[PDB]
Design a protein around this ligand. Structure first.
Ligand SMILES: Nc1ncnc2c1ncn2[C@@H]1O[C@H](COP(=O)(O)OP(=O)(O)O)[C@@H](O)[C@H]1O
Ligand SMILES: Nc1ncnc2c1ncn2[C@@H]1O[C@H](COP(=O)(O)OP(=O)(O)O)[C@@H](O)[C@H]1O
Ligand SMILES: Nc1ncnc2c1ncn2[C@@H]1O[C@H](COP(=O)(O)OP(=O)(O)O)[C@@H](O)[C@H]1O
Ligand SMILES: Nc1ncnc2c1ncn2[C@@H]1O[C@H](COP(=O)(O)OP(=O)(O)O)[C@@H](O)[C@H]1O
Lengths: 313, 574, 200
């Protein structure tokens, strides 16, 4: 009827639930605390022991930019529903104005736009078991926080139409950028949140998670896990990509920067490999039924490699 | 049967002759609706779903299941009828005719007892003979639907279920919701495999596996205002139509549906022809015809769009996002204009929005429209509808420093995921757009100064979202000489419209170059010089009848050695 | 035909006497709309365009193509009728006259099979007479356009398209958007050269 997975725990889904930390780790590298907390939340939800009034899960994500705060939520949505589109993505960046709070729950009666009701309220009513993402929560005003102040404790919200929607089976995730060796920046993030967010609001969130900074082993795994996307895109045109170990080492070497996130790795691969592949494809260097072997020339594998180049077969 | 035919259509009798489309992949939905239909009391399901997911296909699938005999004992030999409420209300000069027709219909289907009734586009029950609070069809059906002696199924959409059914809770009480999910890409693949035969027979053509595979792929990837499998079915139907037109056995392949998608949504996702291939590999010189210098930016944008055209561009990020930083006048807007001319042939196809007007915090609602309950809700956003007219377009943000941080906060989602939710609540696609941001900031050393100024005046996540950071360098003497070349070229092009021919000597051009070199150059200076010392004299001479039409004008120089400052030099117009 | 003349005007009969101005340079739009009319299911295009570009001129060019007979076999010997929604909804004085008239018109189209409809000001299809006990024409024509036994074309300004047609996703579903863009400079010159004879 309503899609809420209050079922008998079969063996397959049980074995999936015990091992879902690895399943989230298939896409999310690092951030073991956040993945563990999400696993505990979903285990508490599916075991039937939960506070009826409170939602299934409420968390706030903070840390550097591009550390998978949104990606963990997207992977969780893919885990629960089978696709990334099912995630309710409400972006708080266009809610800088105070008067824009009506976009969430709807228009009051007597005004224009009363008939279609709210936006997130309707989407919650359609899919009661869904994860709702609020990106850039620091960037909207604190006035809009008050509508969610009810659902982070009671899980009920009243639209402009007047009907009450429920948030008891929804997972709420908030992502911010406050603060931006681990515990000092964790305390800095805590102080930033305490000064910027009212303490009465912060107590209604089940857990606060500080995202850890990306390290070298994380980015060397990241190169493979993200070039898998390029390989899969190439497979749509009967193209095969393989990277040498030196290719991975050079890609991680030129994209390592602790002050930014993983988007530098995207920049590195985009400016080094993908553009060259596009040039060779449109110049017909490689054709259908052919594989591509990318190797690093003029490098030892240990130096910084300011002169290393990529060879294509 | 003698009464139902006058006001309805037998779907089972249609299934006798096989006029219905075969339905595949909806076994779960069929089992759910039959599970509702097997109830004792209040056994009436409703097909709730998005427009274009196969809600009707559910009921023809049910009819096919009945006529094949897959049904259990409770649904055997049940004639299935869709009901035209328009046929009920038509021809009723008095109320007695209308609800007499309705009571005769319900009495007949109760007496026979083997008719399942279908209501298509269900919301019309609230108000049939009169208003909601008077006698209508729904009020008559309340005792029959409540006690559950009548089996009725219906289909409605989410917005309609919210705008017609839900405001009267009595209607939604008697209907169990059964959601018809939008099929996945492989699900639409099997659906296309199933419906291959009818379209191949009608259009007298042949369709290959790669054809509808690529059709489903591009349909899910690119079009963001329609829903599967409907748009892919539309593409297959019109593609068979195009081949049938072109013949007066043909084969339907991926290049045809690619050309169709280009015709429909304007996306140039085509099988690359040789001429446009050589154009794309050599478009750097084509850009260098208009914008001269700044090789790094031209090469970067060339690489980005070469990625876009080769199908190697990431679906969830846009085609390309760039910050154009440098001193004023170098040609940052000229580069975007040149890309617009290359992509579309015209400069008006470039959607240009200035950030100077967004100098206040209250101006943030202009891009994506007004919140509900306020003025300006009906027309919606400004940039969102402009993107909606043309999915493949380049957007320009002139003088990005004048904008304040709330604009970048509202645009971070466009930079990263490439979606934008308007005030209406609809998501607007940006996966086929090119992002251009022009900055005049920081004025080898200029690179560091510009980067420091950008990281000072922008948040770290915004500079993380942007793809490539480009610092425009100051022009050179050869570059301003080629500026003079372009200037005299466009001046002569304007002059040819009035039966006049224009030419300049090398010495005059060198004098123009000598009077047009400073670090405050670009094009805003040395165009003042042209308009003052060449255009002014030409207009002056042509208004009092010298150098008129039919005579070629040559611009020379006098009292100059060709090397000095040329302050005493005077332009001569022969 | 004995019922349709009281509610519509035959553009094919207008094309018999050449009462429509010649159309120049709209080959791409006319071939696209002719392609959409060749479909089996949901063969109903809409000419979305800025007002004053010649959305009605595209339909007149279709009529000229029909009378000159260069259309493929799927449009041979078919009359193009425009539909006057006002005349349909004008004389009712009751509740059931409008639906009876619309059903009679659709029955005539079904029993003839050589009529293509054109609806000026398409957005009036939704709420084409909305009383307390009235059912609009849009819901009546939804099943007819869904399967495709009814073939119609429409012209709509993008603004009013977004105001009314987009608000009802069901009517958006049955309709194929065909964009009629602004003519270029040389296109305007060619159109003026075409119209020069009639204007002199
Ligand atoms: N652990 C991870 N696994 C996979 N991708 C990651 C991970 N961390 C970061 N990314 C990359 O970061 C990008 C998303 O960053 P995001 O978390 O949205 O930053 P922010 O939360 O500041 O907006 C994605 O493109 C993704 O490739
Ligand atoms: N599984 C399927 N098999 C065959 N055709 C399908 C299937 N799913 C959808 N379709 C086609 O897509 C269209 C969906 O129409 P639908 O959305 O049910 O109309 P409505 O919105 O009025 O219920 C139908 O015309 C049908 O031909
Ligand atoms: N190198 C150039 N080639 C051709 N035209 C140019 C060049 N530089 C500037 N222009 C002209 O001068 C104008 C200046 O544009 P731009 O440098 O972007 O201004 P700003 O720096 O204030 O954004 C452009 O619109 C263009 O028409
Ligand atoms: N190719 C063409 N040849 C001749 N006239 C044209 C052409 N294109 C447009 N027109 C002119 O456009 C006008 C039709 O505009 P129309 O579509 O009726 O606008 P609206 O839909 O706003 O009423 C006619 O008067 C016609 O003369």
């Amino acid at each position: 009827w309503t899609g809420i997975p209050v079922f008998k725990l079969t063996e397959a889904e049980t074995t999936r639930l015990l091992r879902m930390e690895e399943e989230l780790h298939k896409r999310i590298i690092g951030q073991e605390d956040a993945v563990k907390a999400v696993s505990k939340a979903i285990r508490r939800t599916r075991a039937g022991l939960k506070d009826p009034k409170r939602p299934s899960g409420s968390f706030i994500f903070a840390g550097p930019s591009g550390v998978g705060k949104t990606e963990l939520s997207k992977a969780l949505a893919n885990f629960l529903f089978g696709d990334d589109d099912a995630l309710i993505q409400i972006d708080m960046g266009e809610f800088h104005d105070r008067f824009t709070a009506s976009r969430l729950f709807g228009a009051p009666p007597g005004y224009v736009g009363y008939e279609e009701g709210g936006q997130l309220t309707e989407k919650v009513r359609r899919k009661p078991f869904s994860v709702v993402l609020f990106d850039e929560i620091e960037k909207a005003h604190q006035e809009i926080y008050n509508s969610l102040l009810q659902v982070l404790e009671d899980g009920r919200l009243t639209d402009g139409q007047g009907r009450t929607v429920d948030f008891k089976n929804t997972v709420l995730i908030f992502t911010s950028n406050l603060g931006t060796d681990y515990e000092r920046m964790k305390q800095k993030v805590n102080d930033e949140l305490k000064k910027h967010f009212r303490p009465e609001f912060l107590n209604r969130i089940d857990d606060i998670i500080v995202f850890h900074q990306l390290t070298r082993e994380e980015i060397i795994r990241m190169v493979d896990l993200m070039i898998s996307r390029v390989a899969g895109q190439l497979k749509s045109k009967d193209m095969a990509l393989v990277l040498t170990d030196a290719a991975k080492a050079l890609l991680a070497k030129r994209g390592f920067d602790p002050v930014l996130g993983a988007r530098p790795l995207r920049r590195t691969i985009q400016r080094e490999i993908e553009d060259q592949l596009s040039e060779k494809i449109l110049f017909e260097e490689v054709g259908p039924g052919q594989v591509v072997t990318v190797d690093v020339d003029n490098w030892d594998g240990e130096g910084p490699g300011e002169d290393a180049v990529f060879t294509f077969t | 049967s003698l009464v139902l035919d006058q006001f309805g259509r037998n779907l089972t009798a249609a299934a006798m002759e096989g006029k219905l489309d075969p339905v595949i992949g909806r076994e779960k939905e069929i089992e759910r609706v039959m599970q509702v239909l097997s109830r004792r009391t209040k056994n009436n399901p409703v097909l709730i779903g998005e427009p274009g997911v196969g809600k009707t296909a559910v009921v023809e699938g049910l009819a096919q299941a009945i006529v094949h005999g897959e049904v259990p004992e409770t649904l055997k030999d049940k004639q299935l009828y869709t009901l035209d409420l328009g046929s009920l209300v038509a021809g009723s000069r008095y109320r007695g005719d209308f609800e007499e027709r309705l009571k005769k219909v319900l009495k007949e289907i109760n007496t026979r007892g083997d008719i399942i009734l279908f209501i298509d586009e269900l919301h019309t029950l609230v108000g049939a003979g009169a208003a909601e609070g008077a006698i209508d069809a729904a009020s008559i059906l309340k005792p029959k639907l409540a006690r559950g002696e009548l089996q009725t199924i219906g289909a409605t959409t989410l917005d309609e279920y919210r705008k017609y059914i839900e405001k009267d809770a009595a209607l939604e009480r008697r209907f169990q919701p059964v959601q018809v999910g939008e099929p996945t890409v492989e699900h639409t693949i099997e659906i296309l495999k199933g419906l291959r035969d009818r379209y191949e027979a009608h259009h007298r053509v042949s369709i290959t596996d790669a054809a509808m595979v690529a059709a489903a792929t591009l349909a899910d990837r690119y079009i963001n205002d329609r829903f599967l499998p409907d748009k892919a079915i539309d593409l297959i139907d019109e593609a068979g139509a195009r081949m049938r037109i072109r013949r007066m056995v043909a084969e339907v392949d991926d290049e045809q549906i690619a050309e169709v998608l280009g015709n429909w949504t304007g996306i140039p996702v085509f099988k690359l022809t040789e001429a446009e291939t050589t154009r794309l590999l050599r478009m750097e010189e084509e850009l260098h015809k208009r914008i001269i210098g700044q090789e790094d930016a031209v090469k970067a944008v060339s690489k980005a769009i070469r990625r876009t055209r080769a199908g190697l561009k990431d679906p969830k990020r846009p085609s390309g996002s760039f910050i154009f930083a440098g001193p004023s006048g170098v040609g940052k807007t000229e580069l975007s204009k040149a890309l617009a001319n290359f992509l579309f042939g015209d400069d008006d196809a470039l959607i240009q929005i200035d950030m100077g007007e967004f100098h206040d915090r209250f101006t943030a609602s202009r891009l994506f429209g007004a919140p509900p309950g306020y003025v300006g809700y009906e027309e919606g956003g400004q940039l969102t509808e402009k993107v909606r007219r043309k999915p493949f377009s380049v957007v320009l943000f002139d003088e990005i420093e004048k904008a304040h941080q709330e604009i970048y906060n509202s645009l971070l989602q466009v930079l990263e995921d490439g979606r934008l939710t308007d005030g209406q609540g609809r998501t607007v696609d940006f996966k086929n757009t090119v992002l251009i941001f022009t900055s005049n900031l920081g004025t080898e050393r200029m690179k560091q100064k510009v980067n420091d100024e950008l990281k000072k005046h922008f948040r770290p996540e915004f500079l993380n979202r942007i793809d490539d950071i480009i610092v425009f360098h100051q022009l050179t003497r050869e570059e301003i000489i080629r500026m003079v070349d372009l200037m005299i070229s466009r001046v002569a092009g304007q002059l040819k419209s009035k039966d006049m021919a224009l030419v300049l000597t090398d010495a005059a051009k060198a004098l123009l170059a000598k009077r047009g070199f400073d670090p405050v150059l670009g094009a805003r200076p040395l165009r003042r010089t042209i308009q003052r010392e060449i255009e002014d004299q030409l207009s002056e001479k042509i208004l009092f009848e010298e150098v008129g039409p039919g005579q070629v004008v040559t611009v020379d120089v006098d009292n100059w050695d060709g090397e000095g400052p040329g302050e005493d030099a005077v332009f001569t117009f022969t």
